[PDB]
Write a structure and sequence with these properties.
- The structure is a homodimer.
- The first copy, chain A, is mostly beta strands.
- Helix content of chain A is 7%, strand content 38%.
- In chain A, strands 1, 2, 3, 4, 5 and 6 form a six-stranded antiparallel β-sheet that branches.
- The radius of gyration of chain A is 13 Å and the shape is globular.
- The relative contact order of chain A is 0.32.
- The structure holds 8-deethyl-8-[BUT-3-enyl]-ascomycin (FK5) (2 copies).
- One 8-deethyl-8-[BUT-3-enyl]-ascomycin sits at the interface of chains B and A.
- Chains A, B: Its main location: cytoplasm.
- Chains A, B: This is Peptidyl-prolyl cis-trans isomerase FKBP1A.
- Chains A, B: It is a peripheral membrane protein.
């Protein structure tokens, strides 16, 4: 499933609804902290909409639990991410993923 | 995992090794038989190599158990395919996939 652990609290009242665009910054890491990707390194937020199979399920369920301005660590089991296959040449088979996500705005 | 059920036997001696190119024809279906893709409909075999995260894990383990000329049904659990996310706009969350695969040749 997905576990959400809060680094900095959000506003406690504006939570993502389907059809809104979530604007986020993220750093993706393996369980030992090794970074494989980051939008912060590109200085460009990532945007996506809930409800459209646009992101791995771990993100669809984890970001829905965050309010605007919150920064959280999402730990996602392989079945809610790339499972037994992994993602070619970046993520191994059976990997639990850790994302540092900041929900900046809803559009 | 992956279950392999044989429709027509292969030669019983030439099995795929890593670094060989497998040439196949396939039809992918949901568990109720609804077709979502087929190389046979495009009249063009699909080619891939074992060992390179080029296909879902269910195929890497299932085709390794087939010999040249064999036609088999591969039933693949969601964790060995697209898990809880699915594949956007084609495959739902938590779907077991059935592939009719024919191993035509190894290159
Ligand atoms: C159309 C092609 C390019 C298109 C690319 C972008 C818009 C640029 C965007 C910043 C992605 C990154 O590009 C630098 C890069 O992000 C990762 O590094 C990563 O951190 C990650 O895991 N993320 C990204 C941030 C949201 C969560 C997750 C994801 O859900 O990502 C999604 C993903 C890969 C899901 C698959 C989709 C197929 C399903 O079958 C499978 O389901 C099992 C899950 C991405 C957003 C796709 O929806 C759309 C894309 O692919 C991947 C390790 C590899 C990925 O590059 C491809
Ligand atoms: C570079 C982009 C285009 C590139 C496309 C081709 C060479 C054309 C090729 C005939 C694919 C089909 O195009 C008509 C189409 O085949 C499906 O319909 C399907 O029947 C299927 O399931 N197949 C295809 C036959 C082998 C098994 C499986 C697969 O393993 O496919 C792989 C797959 C999607 C794996 C993801 C990769 C990311 C991982 O993170 C994730 O791991 C959880 C698993 C394909 C071969 C990729 O390796 C490479 C591609 O994507 C998918 C439902 C959607 C897919 O279109 C994209």
């Amino acid at each position: 499933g997905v576990q959400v652990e809060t680094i900095s609290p959000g506003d406690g009242r504006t939570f993502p609804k389907r059809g809104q665009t979530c604007v986020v910054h993220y750093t993706g890491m393996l369980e030992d902290g090794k970074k494989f990707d980051s939008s912060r390194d590109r200085n460009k937020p990532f945007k996506f909409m809930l409800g459209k199979q646009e992101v791995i399920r771990g993100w669809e369920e984890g970001v829905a639990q965050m309010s605007v301005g919150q920064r959280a660590k999402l730990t996602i089991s392989p079945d809610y991410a790339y499972g037994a296959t992994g993602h070619p040449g970046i993520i191994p088979p059976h990997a639990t993923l850790v994302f540092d996500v900041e929900l900046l705005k809803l559009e």
